[PDB]
């Protein structure tokens, strides 16, 4: 059927908008400032 | 008088006189021949 | 001629202070120290802003970059006809003499100087970038 | 660091050395011109790339060229 | 006729536009006297409008659905339906005056280039030489064709500076 | 020590020899042109007198003669205005009906169909409706016929001839010495007492003897032809005694200290004239009398040739505190030897004064039938505001020029200027922070309101109905000024203006002046103005303080005041000169003043200007400022889109020219973007290809064509940007205010 | 050299700055973080409570404001942790706060203190 | 005696030169073994404002 639940946007929109970008920005920020050995 | 004529021969004065003459000629042509669209 | 040694116990010109002085770079990376000899007390303009008074005799000053030291050197040489010299000081205490490197100003030719970065050809004789492509990194045809 | 190069068309007028604001260029003995001098760049690690030396060069084309390369604290002229 | 257009002498929108312009001018004139300066000026404008509309209709111009004259730029259609006065004759007229100006300027530059300080003559115009060249420029097409045929109009490639490619 | 007239006889011979040698004033330009750049340089250094020579005396003489030439140009312009009002205007007809006849003083010739611009302004006249307000000024002066305006035009031409003769005489025959120009004490004494005080006294005499009786009879309903001539009023005491009983006693009450007897023509009425809508001329006459006495007193303060008086050097040296080091030491020598420092101070105060004039002129209309002429009021406010802003930017430019050329560290060891340059980093950093804070707290409110309005949440906006930001300080000040005539101004019959509060004054069915209420939208636009002014100050101050050196380029003073850059080194040093700071300050001044005039136009058309009906006042826009000025969408739709209808549909009418300019101004402005976003290297290579095509046909000019310089490119771009934007606003304002006002 | 003024040289402001937890130089970094977090969460709970989108509805304005302040404290704790990871990677006395372990403990203490401050500010309004 | 005659007109053959394919007057020719002994003066200045330059023997042709 592939139909997502009714609560799917209420969970995926906040995820993709705040949780995933925060994790991506934190990991990318740590990677950019990492010093080479 | 020679220096004055040389000053009048400078680019801005010559351009001013020439453009005034050309503009006056076009204005007089449009005055005696109003609204010319085709030949 | 011999390379001079920095004297940290050298009087500095009379200056009331400013906000364009040294920053954290002087305490963590490096800074520069300029010294000169003045025949009399004279008011000069600081490269960081303001007017200072150089005293009669030795004068020492600190700057954040080499350009400030050379600007002060140019001002002292062209106006008061003095002969200043500067060094690069590291936080560990190391002092490195910078200008005039060989004791003679670079505008006048001096014996013993070995030419560096000199191409024995003209600009029009430089090769095309295709012959320099796929090198170790971004290289210009003038570098070869 | 920037790349500063001197070419054989230099006439040894010493104008580029006097115009350098960070003491990058100097004069060395030479035999290819009447002035018997040639410009040199032995302190390119302090070059900022202002290109004042190119402005002061009178030869056509220029005898001194500055190619902007890697950027560091000295090349960027940062006092902090 | 051409492109489905109609002559302005038979277009209803053309006469309607003329009536509209005369109506607004008459409406503005209705607020003044009969022997005053604004009345005379408005009457002169009305006569000029009537003469302009009659002259445009007499010229044989083609009007569209908007009642405005349309010009024909194709030489074949213009010469076949009597529209050469729109775009053909003014084309050659502009070409003559433009080439006149260009030829006079080129002659002045060539004349002052062989002097001691040509730049001085470029900033301070030599009025007698410029007037003589301006009067002599009437035969610019014949002189230009002769210069082109003799090979003196252009400069050789070896005498023109170029970039190092 | 001795103030006298020091003049050199025949220093420069009057001849036309140098007229034929362009660039003679400059040593570099006297050689002649080789490239086109020279031509531009010839005009870029024509008035740079300090660059031609280092002799202060020669520069001062050139400046003094140039001032005479400027005054001659101004006199020619004024004479032209009077001549146009006397021969091509409807002033005489407008005098009998100033509430219905539109002022017009320009007529166009009937050529190429341009006669449509001669609109029906009324009074049996056809012309262009003027907005300069000369009709109201002439009516206030008592002018009733075209003969008086024609005589004034002839007198203006005579004055212009005298100004030009004075400039020639002072440059070629009798040139003042340097010590004569350095008499700041004597010059200030004369300018305060003589010029200002005597001018105010003379104007007060004219107002008392001409403006007051003629305007009194005009307001009483007497025809201008029946009103006695000014000389008739000045010749017999019977007419003046009938109009003003105090004139029956002559000048006797003035000498016997019985000034209260002159209360019939020297009052403190305040408010506005209910017949004309302007200020009471008795109040203006009394104002000029008090101003004349005050300035005459102020003109006896400095020491010139006797023991009495003050020495400005001593006063400056005596002001020194523990927080400023030496103090004003060396400031007297700086202002008596540098023309750029004086120009900076004078331009700053002059621009500020022009802005103050615009505000005081709209708030307290001084001319009869001026407040009801909405077009004249809007045009006058906008024009004076723009002149003030331009002069302020020029002040910053000349302050930077002084710091680069005339600054000397040997005379500024520990003065105020030295300490300012010493902590310039702290000054600029704090000003930068306050600019960011103001920008966020001013623009973010509008963005928040736009977002909340678009999200369907009007209850979360910064408006009067929702969360409000009321200007309590301004409202308290307004109430204080409105209540002033009862407690803190016992002799004032009314308040200074009606903007504080009270009843409205209407003339000819149109609101001349009514109270102006301030709400949340006013608070937001005021903070927007404060933020824009702070950013303009930041750019100009940064360009002045960092003009000699900075942490990036320690030898900027050696590069001069106007230089393009210092190369692509140090990451890039593009636009480091003080000239570039002035170049950016011009854009910011344009932005600030544009928002200021936009706010003035919307506020006046929404809460002040409008018609008067039975039991109610209907405004031009219906009072939509308080509800729509809190969002950017409101400014774009209700103010820009709604009010631009008059200028876009003006074709086919007398205001069509405005519409044409409205389009032309959009062109020039966009044209500016070509010079501001590009560089001269591209244009130089394109010129190389065009030169190749010219060399092929042997039409290459001897003067080598070069692209405009980097500085010239920036100057051309900013000039076109300012011209296009200001002309766009001018066309929009004039067309809208003439069609609906 | 530098510019000295009474604002930056007064002994009263120097003592006030030295009394602050950040300039203690000798206490545990986790304690410093707890103190700073409490002092910040208490003031942070205010704006969300009195100006948030649910500020007019009763019995839930404080709940929403406290939850928003708690989320902000969590974001600030994550910012402190990434700052410590990207600042201390290699190499009076040296303050232990300016170290990888010291800053990590400081960030954890800030998180605990901030959440406790938010919870205390919520119950203080009841 | 090596090089063009003093005061004569020559054409510049240097491709990177501003005066490439242009005529300039010969000022002086160095008699030593320098790389560029010919000195050429031009009526039109370059972008740097210079009107003279040094060229080799094979970089100039009598034109």
Curated annotation (Swiss-Prot), chain B:
Gene3D superfamilies in UniProt: Single helix bin
Location (main, coarse): plastid
UniProt KW keywords: Chloroplast, Membrane, Photosynthesis, Photosystem I, Plastid, Thylakoid, Transmembrane, Transmembrane helix
Membrane-spanning ranges: 7-27
InterPro entries: PSI_PsaJ, PSI_PsaJ_sf
Membrane topology, as annotated: Single-pass membrane protein
Any one Gene Ontology cellular component term annotated for this protein: photosystem I
UniProt keyword Plastid, yes or no: yes
One GO process term, biological-process aspect: photosynthesis
Cellular localisation: Plastid, Chloroplast thylakoid membrane
Short name of one Pfam family: PSI_PsaJ
Family of the protein in this entry: Belongs to the PsaJ family.
Annotated function: May help in the organization of the PsaE and PsaF subunits.
Protein name: Photosystem I reaction center subunit IX
Species annotation: Chlamydomonas reinhardtii
Source lineage: Eukaryota, Viridiplantae, Chlorophyta, core chlorophytes, Chlorophyceae
UniProtKB/Swiss-Prot annotation, chain C:
Entry superkingdom: Eukaryota
A GO BP annotation: photosynthesis
Cellular compartment(s): Plastid, Chloroplast thylakoid membrane
Key words, A-Z: Chloroplast, Membrane, Photosynthesis, Photosystem I, Plastid, Thylakoid, Transit peptide
Purpose of the protein: PsaD can form complexes with ferredoxin and ferredoxin-oxidoreductase in photosystem I (PS I) reaction center. PSAD may encode the ferredoxin-docking protein.
Coiled coil, from the record: none
Family named by the database record: Belongs to the PsaD family.
Protein's name according to its UniProt entry: Photosystem I reaction center subunit II, chloroplastic
Topology in the lipid bilayer: Peripheral membrane protein
Claim: Zinc is one of the keywords in the record: no
Keyword Zinc-finger: no
A GO term from the CC aspect: chloroplast thylakoid membrane
Taxonomic classification: Eukaryota, Viridiplantae, Chlorophyta, core chlorophytes, Chlorophyceae
Span covered, complete protein: 53 to 196 of 196
Segments passing through the bilayer: none
Curated annotation (Swiss-Prot), chain D:
Principal localisation: plastid
Keyword Electron transport (UniProt): yes
Residues noted as binding [4Fe-4S] cluster 1 in the record, renumbered to the chain: 10, 13, 16, 57
InterPro entries, A to Z: 4Fe4S_Fe-S-bd, 4Fe4S_Fe_S_CS, PSI_iron-sulfur_center, PSI_PsaC
Subcellular location field: Plastid, Chloroplast thylakoid membrane
Domain 4Fe-4S ferredoxin-type, residue spans: 1-30, 38-67
Gene3D superfamilies linked: 3.30.70.20
Annotated cofactor note: Binds 2 [4Fe-4S] clusters. Cluster 2 is most probably the spectroscopically characterized electron acceptor FA and cluster 1 is most probably FB.
Catalytic activity from the UniProt record: reduced [plastocyanin] + hnu + oxidized [2Fe-2S]-[ferredoxin] = oxidized [plastocyanin] + reduced [2Fe-2S]-[ferredoxin]
EC number: 1.97.1.12
Keywords annotated in UniProt: 4Fe-4S, Chloroplast, Electron transport, Iron, Iron-sulfur, Membrane, Metal-binding, Oxidoreductase, Photosynthesis, Photosystem I, Plastid, Repeat, Thylakoid, Transport
Listed result of changing residue 48 to I: Leads to partial destabilization of PSI. Unable to grow photoautotrophically
Effect of residue 11 to V: 60-fold increase in affinity of PSI for ferredoxin. Unable to grow photoautotrophically
Result of altering residue 34 to T: Drastically decreases affinity of PSI for ferredoxin. Decreases cross-linking of ferredoxin to PSI-D and PSI-E
GO biological process, one term: photosynthesis
Subunit relationships: The eukaryotic PSI reaction center is composed of at least 11 subunits.
HAMAP family in UniProt: PSI_PsaC (MF_01303)
Name of the protein: Photosystem I iron-sulfur center
Curated annotation (Swiss-Prot), chain F:
A biological process from GO: photosynthesis
Top-level taxonomic group: Eukaryota
Record PROSITE patterns: PHOTOSYSTEM_I_PSAAB
Residues where chlorophyll a binds: 674, 682
Name of the protein in its database record: Photosystem I P700 chlorophyll a apoprotein A1
Binding-site residues for [4Fe-4S] cluster, renumbered to this chain: 565, 574
Signal peptide: none
Gene Ontology MF terms in the entry: 4 iron, 4 sulfur cluster binding; chlorophyll binding; electron transfer activity; magnesium ion binding; oxidoreductase activity
UniProt xrefs under PANTHER family: OUTER MEMBRANE PROTEIN, OMPA-RELATED, PHOTOSYSTEM I P700 CHLOROPHYLL A APOPROTEIN A1-RELATED
Residues reported in the UniProt entry to bind chlorophyll a': 666
Listed result of changing residue 666 to Q: Impairment of P700 function. More severe
GO CC annotation: chloroplast thylakoid membrane; photosystem I
Organism: Chlamydomonas reinhardtii (Chlamydomonas smithii)
Effect of residue 666 to F/L: Loss of P700 function
Subunit structure: The PsaA/B heterodimer binds the P700 chlorophyll special pair and subsequent electron acceptors. PSI consists of a core antenna complex that captures photons, and an electron transfer chain that converts photonic excitation into a charge separation. The eukaryotic PSI reaction center is composed of at least 11 subunits.
Stretches that traverse the bilayer: 63-86, 149-172, 188-212, 284-302, 339-362, 378-404, 426-448, 523-541, 581-602, 655-677, 715-735
Subcellular location, record wording: Plastid, Chloroplast thylakoid membrane
Disulfide bonds: none
Alphabetical list of InterPro entries matching this protein: PSI_PsaA (IPR006243), PSI_PsaA/B (IPR001280), PSI_PsaA/B_CS (IPR020586), PSI_PsaA/B_sf (IPR036408)
Enzyme class: oxidoreductase
């Amino acid at each position: 059927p592939f139909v997502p639940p009714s609560w799917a946007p209420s969970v995926f929109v906040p995820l993709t908008g705040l949780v995933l970008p925060a994790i991506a920005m934190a990991t990318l920020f740590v990677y950019i400032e990492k010093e080479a050995p | 008088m020679k220096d004055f004529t040389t000053y009048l021969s400078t680019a801005p004065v010559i351009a001013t006189i020439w453009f005034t003459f050309t503009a006056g000629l076009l204005i007089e042509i449009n005055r005696y021949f109003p609204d010319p669209l085709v030949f | 001629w011999t390379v001079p040694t920095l004297n940290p116990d050298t009087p500095s010109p009379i200056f009331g202070g400013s906000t364009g002085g040294l920053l954290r770079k002087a305490q963590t990376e490096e800074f520069y120290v300029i010294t000169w000899e003045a025949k009399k007390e004279q008011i000069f303009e600081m490269p960081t802003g303001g007017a200072a008074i150089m005293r009669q005799g030795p004068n020492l000053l600190k700057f954040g970059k080499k350009e400030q030291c050379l600007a002060l050197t140019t001002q002292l040489r062209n106006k008061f006809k003095l002969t200043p010299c500067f060094y690069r000081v590291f936080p560990d205490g190391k002092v490195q003499y910078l200008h005039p490197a060989d004791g003679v100003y670079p505008e006048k030719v001096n014996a013993g100087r070995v030419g560096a970065n000199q191409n024995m050809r003209r600009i029009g004789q430089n090769v095309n970038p295709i012959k320099v492509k796929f090198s170790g990194r971004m290289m210009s045809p003038a570098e070869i | 660091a920037h790349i500063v190069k001197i070419y054989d068309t230099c006439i040894g007028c010493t104008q580029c050395v006097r115009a350098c604001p960070l003491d990058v260029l100097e004069m060395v003995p030479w035999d290819g011109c009447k002035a018997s001098q040639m410009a040199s760049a032995p302190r390119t690690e302090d070059c900022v790339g202002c290109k004042r030396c190119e402005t002061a060069c009178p030869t056509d084309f220029l005898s001194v060229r500055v190619y902007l390369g890697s950027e560091s604290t000295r090349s960027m002229g940062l006092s902090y | 006729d051409i492109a489905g257009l109609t002559p302005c002498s038979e277009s209803k929108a053309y006469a309607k536009l003329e009536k509209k312009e005369l109506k607004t001018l008459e409406k503005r004139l209705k607020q003044y006297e009969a022997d005053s300066a604004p009345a005379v000026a408005l009457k002169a404008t009305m006569e000029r409008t009537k003469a302009r509309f009659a002259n445009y209709a007499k010229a044989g111009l083609l009007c569209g659905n908007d009642g405005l004259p349309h010009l024909i730029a194709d030489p074949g259609l213009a010469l076949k339906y009597g529209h050469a006065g729109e775009v053909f004759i003014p084309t050659f007229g502009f070409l003559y005056v433009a080439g006149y100006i260009g030829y006079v300027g080129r002659q002045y530059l060539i004349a002052v280039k062989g002097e001691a300080k040509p730049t001085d003559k470029e900033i301070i115009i030599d009025v007698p030489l410029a007037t003589k060249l301006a009067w002599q420029g009437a035969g610019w097409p014949l002189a230009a064709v002769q210069e082109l045929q003799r090979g003196t109009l252009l400069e050789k490639e070896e005498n023109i500076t170029v970039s190092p490619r | 020590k001795k103030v006298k007239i020091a003049v050199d006889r025949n220093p420069v011979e009057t001849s036309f020899e140098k007229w034929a040698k362009p660039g003679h004033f400059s040593r570099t330009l006297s050689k002649g042109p080789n490239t086109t750049t020279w031509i531009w340089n010839l005009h870029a250094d024509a008035h740079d007198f300090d660059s031609h020579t280092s002799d202060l005396e020669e520069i001062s003489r050139k400046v003094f003669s140039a001032h005479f030439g400027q005054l001659g140009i101004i006199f020619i312009w004024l004479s032209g205005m009077y001549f146009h009002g006397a021969r091509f205007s409807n002033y005489e007809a407008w005098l009998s009906d100033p509430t219905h006849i539109k002022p017009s003083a320009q007529v166009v010739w009937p050529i190429v169909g341009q006669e449509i611009l001669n609109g029906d302004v009324g009074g049996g006249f056809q012309g262009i409706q003027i907005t300069s307000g000369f009709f109201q000024l002439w009516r206030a002066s008592g002018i009733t016929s075209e003969l008086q305006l024609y005589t004034t035009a002839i007198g203006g031409l005579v004055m212009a001839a005298a100004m030009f003769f004075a400039g020639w005489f002072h440059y070629h025959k009798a040139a003042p010495k340097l010590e004569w120009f350095q008499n700041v004490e004597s010059m200030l004494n004369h300018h305060l007492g003589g010029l200002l005080g005597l001018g105010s006294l003379a104007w007060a005499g004219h107002q008392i003897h001409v403006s007051l009786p003629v305007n009194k009879l005009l307001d009483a309903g007497v025809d201008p032809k029946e009103i006695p001539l000014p000389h008739d009023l000045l010749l017999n005491r019977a007419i003046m005694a009938d109009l003003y009983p105090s004139f029956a006693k002559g000048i006797a009450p003035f000498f016997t200290l019985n000034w209260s007897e002159y209360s019939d023509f020297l009052t403190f009425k305040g408010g506005l004239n209910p017949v004309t809508g302007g200020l009471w001329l008795s109040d203006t006459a009394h104002h000029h009398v008090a101003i004349a006495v005050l300035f005459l007193v102020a003109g006896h303060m400095y020491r010139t040739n006797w023991g009495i008086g003050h020495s400005m050097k001593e006063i400056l040296e005596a002001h020194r505190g523990p927080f400023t080091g030496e103090g004003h030491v060396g400031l007297y020598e700086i202002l008596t030897t540098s023309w750029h420092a004086q120009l900076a101070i004078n331009l700053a105060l002059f621009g500020s004064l022009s802005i103050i004039v615009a505000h005081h002129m709209y708030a307290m209309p001084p001319y009869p039938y001026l407040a009801t002429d909405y077009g004249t009021q809007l045009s006058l406010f906008t024009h004076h505001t723009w002149i003030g802003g331009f002069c302020i930017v020029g002040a910053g430019a000349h302050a930077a020029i002084f710091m680069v050329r005339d600054y000397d560290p040997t005379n500024n060891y520990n003065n105020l200027l030295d300490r300012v340059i010493r902590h310039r980093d702290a000054i600029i950093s704090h000003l930068n922070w306050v600019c960011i804070f103001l920008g966020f707290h001013s623009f973010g409110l509008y963005i928040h309101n736009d977002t909340m309005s678009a999200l369907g949440r009007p209850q979360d906006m910064f408006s009067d109905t929702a969360i409000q930001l009321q200007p309590v300080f301004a409202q308290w000040i307004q109430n204080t000024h409105f209540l002033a005539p009862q407690l803190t101004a016992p002799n004032a019959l009314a308040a200074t203006s009606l903007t504080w509060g009270g009843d409205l004054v209407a003339v000819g069915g149109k609101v001349a002046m009514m109270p102006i209420s301030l709400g949340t939208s006013d608070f937001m636009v005021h903070h927007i103005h404060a933020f824009t002014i702070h950013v303009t100050v930041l750019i100009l101050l940064k360009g002045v303080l960092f003009a000699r050196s900075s942490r990036l380029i320690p030898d900027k003073a050696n590069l001069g005041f106007r230089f393009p850059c210092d190369g692509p080194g140090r990451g890039g040093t593009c636009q480091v000169s003080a000239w570039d700071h002035v170049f950016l300050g011009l854009f910011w001044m344009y932005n600030s003043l544009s928002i200021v005039i936009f706010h003035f136009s919307w506020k006046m058309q929404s809460d002040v200007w409008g018609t008067v009906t039975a039991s109610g006042v209907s405004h031009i826009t219906g009072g939509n400022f308080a509800q729509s000025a809190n969002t950017i969408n409101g400014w774009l739709r209700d103010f820009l889109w709604a009010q631009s209808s008059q200028v876009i549909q003006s074709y086919g009418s007398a205001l069509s020219a405005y519409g044409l300019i409205f389009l032309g101004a959009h062109f020039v402005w966009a044209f500016s973007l070509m010079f501001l976003f590009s560089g001269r290297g591209y244009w130089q290579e394109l010129i190389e290809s065009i030169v190749w095509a010219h060399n092929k046909l042997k039409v290459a000019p001897a003067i080598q064509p070069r692209a405009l310089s980097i500085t010239q490119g920036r100057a051309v771009g900013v000039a076109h940007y300012l011209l296009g934007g200001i002309a766009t606003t001018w066309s929009f304002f004039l067309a809208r205010i003439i069609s609906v006002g | 050299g530098m510019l000295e003024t009474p604002v930056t040289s007064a002994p009263i402001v120097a003592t006030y700055l030295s009394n602050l937890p950040a300039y203690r130089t000798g206490v545990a970094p986790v304690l410093r973080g707890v103190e700073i977090g409490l002092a910040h969460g208490f003031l942070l709970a205010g704006p969300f409570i009195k100006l948030g989108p649910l500020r007019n509805v009763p019995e839930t304005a404080e709940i929403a404001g406290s939850l928003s302040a708690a989320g902000l404290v969590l974001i600030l704790a994550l910012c402190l942790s990434i700052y410590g990871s990207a600042q201390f990677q290699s190499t009076v006395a040296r303050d232990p706060l300016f170290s990888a372990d010291g800053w990590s403990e400081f960030a954890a203490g800030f998180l605990v203190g901030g959440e406790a401050g938010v919870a205390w500010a919520y119950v203080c309004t009841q | 005696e090596v090089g063009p005659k003093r005061g004569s007109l020559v054409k510049i053959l240097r491709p990177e030169s501003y005066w490439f394919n242009q005529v300039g007057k010969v000022v002086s020719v160095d008699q030593s073994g320098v790389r560029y002994p010919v000195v050429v003066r031009f009526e039109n200045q370059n972008y740097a404002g210079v009107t003279t330059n040094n060229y080799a023997l094979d970089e100039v042709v009598a034109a």
